[PDB]
Amino acid sequence: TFKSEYPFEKRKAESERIADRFPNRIPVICEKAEKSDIPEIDKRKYLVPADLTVGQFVYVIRKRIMLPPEKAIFIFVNDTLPPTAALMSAIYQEHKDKDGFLYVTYSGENTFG
Amino acid sequence: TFKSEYPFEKRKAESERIADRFPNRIPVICEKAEKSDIPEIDKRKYLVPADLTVGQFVYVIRKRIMLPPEKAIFIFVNDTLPPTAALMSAIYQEHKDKDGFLYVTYSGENTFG
Amino acid sequence: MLKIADQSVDLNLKLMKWRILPDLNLDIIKNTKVLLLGAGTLGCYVSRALIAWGVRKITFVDNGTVSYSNPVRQALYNFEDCGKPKAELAAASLKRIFPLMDATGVKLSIPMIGHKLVNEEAQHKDFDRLRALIKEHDIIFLLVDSRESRWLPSLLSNIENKTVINAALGFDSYLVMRHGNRDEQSSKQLGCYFCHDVVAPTDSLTDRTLDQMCTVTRPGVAMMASSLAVELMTSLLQTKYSGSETTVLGDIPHQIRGFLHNFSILKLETPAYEHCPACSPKVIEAFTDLGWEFVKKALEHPLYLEEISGLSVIKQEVER
Amino acid sequence: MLKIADQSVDLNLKLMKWRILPDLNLDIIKNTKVLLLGAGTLGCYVSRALIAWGVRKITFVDNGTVSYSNPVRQALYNFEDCGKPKAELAAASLKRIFPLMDATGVKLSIPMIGHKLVNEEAQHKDFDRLRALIKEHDIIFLLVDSRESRWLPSLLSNIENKTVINAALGFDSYLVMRHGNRDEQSSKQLGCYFCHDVVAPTDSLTDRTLDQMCTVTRPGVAMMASSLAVELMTSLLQTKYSGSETTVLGDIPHQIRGFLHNFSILKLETPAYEHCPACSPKVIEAFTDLGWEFVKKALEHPLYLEEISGLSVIKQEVER
Ligand SMILES: Nc1ncnc2c1ncn2[C@@H]1O[C@H](COP(=O)(O)OP(=O)(O)OP(=O)(O)O)[C@@H](O)[C@H]1O
Ligand SMILES: Nc1ncnc2c1ncn2[C@@H]1O[C@H](COP(=O)(O)OP(=O)(O)OP(=O)(O)O)[C@@H](O)[C@H]1O
Ligand SMILES: [Mg+2]
Ligand SMILES: [Mg+2]
Ligand SMILES: [Zn+2]
Ligand SMILES: [Zn+2]
Numbered sequence: 001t002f003k004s005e006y007p008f009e010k011r012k013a014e015s016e017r018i019a020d021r022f023p024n025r026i027p028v029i030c031e032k033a034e035k036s037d038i039p040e041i042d043k044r045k046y047l048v049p050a051d052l053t054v055g056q057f058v059y060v061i062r063k064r065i066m067l068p069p070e071k072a073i074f075i076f077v078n079d080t081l082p083p084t085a086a087l088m089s090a091i092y093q094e095h096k097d098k099d100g101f102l103y104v105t106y107s108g109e110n111t112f113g
Numbered sequence: 114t115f116k117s118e119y120p121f122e123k124r125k126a127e128s129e130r131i132a133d134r135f136p137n138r139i140p141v142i143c144e145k146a147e148k149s150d151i152p153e154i155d156k157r158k159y160l161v162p163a164d165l166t167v168g169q170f171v172y173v174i175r176k177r178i179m180l181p182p183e184k185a186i187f188i189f190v191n192d193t194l195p196p197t198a199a200l201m202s203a204i205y206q207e208h209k210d211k212d213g214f215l216y217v218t219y220s221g222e223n224t225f226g
Numbered sequence: 227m228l229k230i231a232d233q234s235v236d237l238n239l240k241l242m243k244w245r246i247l248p249d250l251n252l253d254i255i256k257n258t259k260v261l262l263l264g265a266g267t268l269g270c271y272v273s274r275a276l277i278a279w280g281v282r283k284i285t286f287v288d289n290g291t292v293s294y295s296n297p298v299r300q301a302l303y304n305f306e307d308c309g310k311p312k313a314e315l316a317a318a319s320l321k322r323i324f325p326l327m328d329a330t331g332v333k334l335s336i337p338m339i340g341h342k343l344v345n346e347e348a349q350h351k352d353f354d355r356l357r358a359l360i361k362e363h364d365i366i367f368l369l370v371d372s373r374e375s376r377w378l379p380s381l382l383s384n385i386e387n388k389t390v391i392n393a394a395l396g397f398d399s400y401l402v403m404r405h406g407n408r409d410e411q412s413s414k415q416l417g418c419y420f421c422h423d424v425v426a427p428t429d430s431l432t433d434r435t436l437d438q439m440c441t442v443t444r445p446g447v448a449m450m451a452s453s454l455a456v457e458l459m460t461s462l463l464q465t466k467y468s469g470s471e472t473t474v475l476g477d478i479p480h481q482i483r484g485f486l487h488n489f490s491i492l493k494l495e496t497p498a499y500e501h502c503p504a505c506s507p508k509v510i511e512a513f514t515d516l517g518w519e520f521v522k523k524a525l526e527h528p529l530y531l532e533e534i535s536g537l538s539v540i541k542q543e544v545e546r
Numbered sequence: 547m548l549k550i551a552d553q554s555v556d557l558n559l560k561l562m563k564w565r566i567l568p569d570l571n572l573d574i575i576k577n578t579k580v581l582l583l584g585a586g587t588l589g590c591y592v593s594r595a596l597i598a599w600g601v602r603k604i605t606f607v608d609n610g611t612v613s614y615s616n617p618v619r620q621a622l623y624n625f626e627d628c629g630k631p632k633a634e635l636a637a638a639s640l641k642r643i644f645p646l647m648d649a650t651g652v653k654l655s656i657p658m659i660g661h662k663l664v665n666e667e668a669q670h671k672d673f674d675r676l677r678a679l680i681k682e683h684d685i686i687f688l689l690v691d692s693r694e695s696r697w698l699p700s701l702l703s704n705i706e707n708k709t710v711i712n713a714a715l716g717f718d719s720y721l722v723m724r725h726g727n728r729d730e731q732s733s734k735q736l737g738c739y740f741c742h743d744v745v746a747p748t749d750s751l752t753d754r755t756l757d758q759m760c761t762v763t764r765p766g767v768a769m770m771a772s773s774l775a776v777e778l779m780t781s782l783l784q785t786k787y788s789g790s791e792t793t794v795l796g797d798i799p800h801q802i803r804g805f806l807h808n809f810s811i812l813k814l815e816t817p818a819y820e821h822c823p824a825c826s827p828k829v830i831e832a833f834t835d836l837g838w839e840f841v842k843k844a845l846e847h848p849l850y851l852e853e854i855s856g857l858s859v860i861k862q863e864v865e866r
Binding site for chain 4: 227230231234235237238239241242245246271274275277278279293294295297298299301304305306308322323324325397398436440442443444445446447449450452453454456457460475476477479482486487488489490491493
């Protein structure tokens with residue numbers, strides 16, 4: 001994990017250094033849910049623009065991650081499913097960790113029955 | 114409910130007035146779980162002694178409440194089942210609400226299968 | 227002996243109202259006509275949970291047959307049943323439990339978006355058949371096993387204005403949720419199974435291999451998802467309380483997701499997403515305007531669907 | 547066709563290990579001998595969840611017969627089954643699902659503490675019969691419907707050192723928990739069903755009337771409690787991880803309680819209470835020292851039990 005490899009100080013720091021330098025971007029750490037059965041890449045660090053919607057941020061994730069369009073996914077943000085039509089900024093305003101970053105988890109969507 | 118009929122001020126007050134007067138007793142509010150199928154009495158206010166165990170506090174509840182010995186019950190303390198062999202004080206030290214009182218819920222124990 | 231049996235089951239239901247929840251409405255539940263899209267693990271458990279609740283009219287929709295490994299996981303079929311068609315065996319099965327049940331089994335194939343149309347007329351009949359079934363029932367349970375099989379039913383159900391309870395399993399988790407319904411008086415509509423991603427449901431089985439994904443799940447998920455699914459329906463069926471999102475049977479969540487590794491359960495809520503390839507207003511308009519003509523297009527061209535709902539206008543925006 | 551069927555079910559289990567959890571141990575589960583005290587709603591669901599997991603040896607212990615209202619809630623019985631003895635019908639029922647199952651039905655009556663002994667010798671035989679059954683199996687599931695019926699099984703199981711998974715339902719909730727086992731090397735023992743109150747289990751049925759309590763529950767609780775109960779057993783059966791209370795299948799809670807009105811689930815833990823009228827050291831000593839002689843006394847004098855465990859020395863202390 002990201003937090004499991006960096007303390008509050010070093011994490012609360014790169015957060016402000018990112019806010020001070022790019023007041024238009026949003027510090028997001030995106031990684032796959034623990035027990036989910038889908039693809040993942042070393043790029044856990046993302047600095048998306050505030051005007052970009054969750055949907056748009058989701059496209060990036062599955063794109064960058066090389067996920068096929070036949071399989072869907074959902075994302076958690078503090079055990080919550082953010083509206084797909086919400087601005088990544090408004091989300092950051094409500095779910096940002098005290099360390100400056102917005103933690104996001106993605107997992108394969110359930111389809112069996 | 115008790116909190117539903119009294120604000121933080123009036124509640125954070127009778128708590129200190131009880132601590133200042135009886136530094137040996139423990140301010141406990143005991144009421145039946147919302148959806149439980151068992152007896153309840155208007156006496157929601159209890160000032161038990163710190164050396165008394167949870168078990169002993171449980172005896173009081175079912176006694177004062179007039180509950181038969183054929184039916185059992187369990188108690189919650191911040192969605193937790195306190196060891197039956199613990200001192201009501203040690204419990205108060207860990208689950209007391211910022212309002213000075215230790216909130217306790219009791220409910221009929223499950224026995225069907 | 228049927229009378230005395232009927233009376234016995236009936237009394238058990240009456241007792242929970244009479245002695246525990248007098249405000250409880252059992253009649254609404256009893257009379258509810260239920261349509262089960264899927265007669266597999268979820269379909270079997272959900273159906274067992276519904277007769278226990280007193281529901282009398284249940285219809286199974288499934289086009290498969292009882293496989294050798296089905297019995298141990300699909301609680302309505304036995305080993306001797308192997309080879310036989312599911313939907314019907316399933317309805318017969320409920321009757322062996324409660325003979326007065328009005329159980330029916332329709333061997334219907336749900337046209338899947340993303341797959342090539344093999345027989346236009348034949349699959350146009352399938353289409354109308356499904357809509358009629360959704361039209362006559364009150365609650366539709368989407369208990370199929372693929373993302374694609376959920377699209378058409380989600381839409382028709384939205385059009386016919388029926389309540390939909392969607393349940394889907396993962397290896398370690400499960401999702402149970404009710405789709406929103408479009409209300410003229412309320413500018414508030416809850417999302418549907420499809421409002422969570424930005425891809426148009428498409429063929430995911432034809433190209434599938436073990437490499438892609440195994441379909442096995444932990445036995446527990448099926449049982450849980452089913453019970454929660456039925457308890458959601460029974461609560462949702464109760465008049466809610468004036469100043470709250472609760473009823474006599476408690477809350478009425480929009481979405482419920484569970485996980486076995488950490489024995490948890492989350493309640494959630496997601497508003498209808500305007501670019502949903504299923505509940506989006508643009509998609510509803512297209513259906514109301516062109517019926518089977520439009521659906522045939524979405525069915526064979528998932529990307530088309532995206533062009534219609536706007537999922538392209540937003541990826542295209544990010545693309546620049 | 548039995549071979550091809552066996553292979554089919556087997557492959558489904560193997561796939562979850564091979565493709566998802568390679569560390570998973572299916573053999574331990576398969577070979578586990580399970581004893582089900584109770585063949586009612588919980589017993590039926592738990593048993594269905596266990597064959598799905600691959601368990602082959604399951605024994606039902608129940609002394610009742612199929613009632614008219616049982617079918618709709620007890621998923622192993624049909625309407626035609628009414629009047630017939632449960633335990634056996636139940637084992638027959640599992641076989642109709644998977645013929646290779648080693649299902650057995652023992653029509654045994656569990657002597658209930660608090661009730662008068664009606665036939666010493668007869669109920670002494672019952673006693674030994676039950677202990678033998680607990681002795682031969684590996685996991686005992688306490689799925690009975692009264693507080694009293696849980697006492698003897700809790701104790702014998704503690705004495706024989708078997709793992710016990712206890713499940714009990716309420717109208718709106720459910721409790722699923724594993725009793726602790728006394729370890730010489732570990733001064734840490736988890737509590738049992740009885741460590742939560744301070745009264746000795748006693749007769750609660752003889753005096754019971756509708757006024758006392760109705761036995762009906764919301765259908766959902768049974769299904770949930772069962773699945774969680776089996777998923778607990780399958781996890782608990784996995785070697786836990788060096789520095790944690792987890793395994794390949796996740797956590798291994800001590801106690802799980804759920805509620806339907808607010809779709810919740812809590813994990814909890816309670817240490818063995820020394821004055822437990824079931825797992826208390828004083829009670830174990832008495833049993834090891836006097837066997838059936840002591841039990842006969844507790845059986846007819848619940849208060850005696852209290853005198854033995856110390857539940858009196860503490861109420862007597864508060865009494866002053
Ligand atoms: N397009 C469809 N039309 C009608 N029924 C369908 C359709 N797609 C899936 N089903 C039914 O949905 C059910 C899903 O049950 P389930 O997936 O649990 O078991 P299964 O599909 O039979 O095989 P398995 O146990 O390996 O998953 C099946 O009975 C299947 O026949
Ligand atoms: N002392 C006992 N010895 C053996 N079996 C028992 C004993 N006590 C209870 N049982 C069995 O435990 C099971 C509990 O199942 P359950 O309570 O769900 O249904 P029921 O007891 O048959 O009637 P109901 O559906 O109204 O509860 C029953 O099958 C019952 O016969
Ligand atoms: Mg399938
Ligand atoms: Mg019973
Ligand atoms: Zn939607
Ligand atoms: Zn105990």
